[PDB]
């Protein structure tokens, strides 16, 4: 029980400090925003 | 009120509202981050 409690207490730090993952969700958000921004920025091209 | 506005040849449709944006005296209109017109200057009242 003590070992589990220590590990579950370290989770709250290692989730946002060690990074590793949690970049996948942000990457999904960033890819969606990039796609939408590029789509609405292509409206400024004369295309000839 | 959603209107068809024609500012000195610039044609568009939308609602024109009072703006807190401070245009420098040489600046005539403002563009959003994706190059869409966001603010305009009144030729008569010099209003943003
Ligand atoms: C046009 O005339 C009005 C008064 O009728 C004046 O307030 C306005 O500044 C003038 N527009 C200019 C100088 O662009």
What is the C-alpha to C-alpha distance for residues A11 and A8, in angstroms, rounded to an integer? 5
CA of B7 from ligand 1 middle (Å) equals: 14
Length, in residues, of chain B: 48
Cβ contact B41:B47 at 8 Å: yes
CA separation, residue A20 to residues A16, A26, A29, B4 (Å): 9, 12, 17, 52
Tell me the three state secondary structure of residue B30: strand
Mutation target to probe the B interface, by most B beta carbons within 10 A, among A36, A39, A40 is: A40
Do B16 and B34 meet the contact criterion of CB atoms below 8 Å apart? no
CA pair distance A28, A34, nearest whole angstrom: 10
Cβ count within 10 A of residue B32: 10
Distances (CA, A) of B29 to B4, B13, B18, B24: 17, 16, 14, 10
B10-14 vs B29-31, strand pairing mode: unpaired
Q: Which helix (H) or strand (E) holds B12?
A: strand B10-14
Resolution, given in Å to one decimal, reads 2.9
Residue B48 has which token pair? 């943003």
Q: Token digits for A26?
A: 């942000």
Experimental method: cryo-EM
Q: Are A27 and A35 spatial neighbours (Cβ–Cβ below 8 Å)?
A: no
Closest chain A residue by Cα to residue B31 = A44
């Amino acid at each position: 029980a003590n070992q589990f409690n220590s590990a579950i207490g370290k989770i709250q730090d290692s989730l946002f400090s060690t990074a590793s993952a949690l970049g996948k969700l942000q990457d999904v958000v960033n890819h969606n925003a990039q796609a939408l921004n590029t789509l609405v920025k292509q409206l400024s091209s004369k295309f000839g | 009120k959603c209107v068809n506005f024609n500012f000195n040849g610039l044609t568009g449709t939308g609602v024109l509202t009072k703006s807190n944006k401070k245009f420098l005296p040489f600046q005539q209109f403002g563009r959003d981050i994706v190059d869409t017109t966001d603010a305009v200057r009144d030729p008569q009242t010099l209003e943003i």
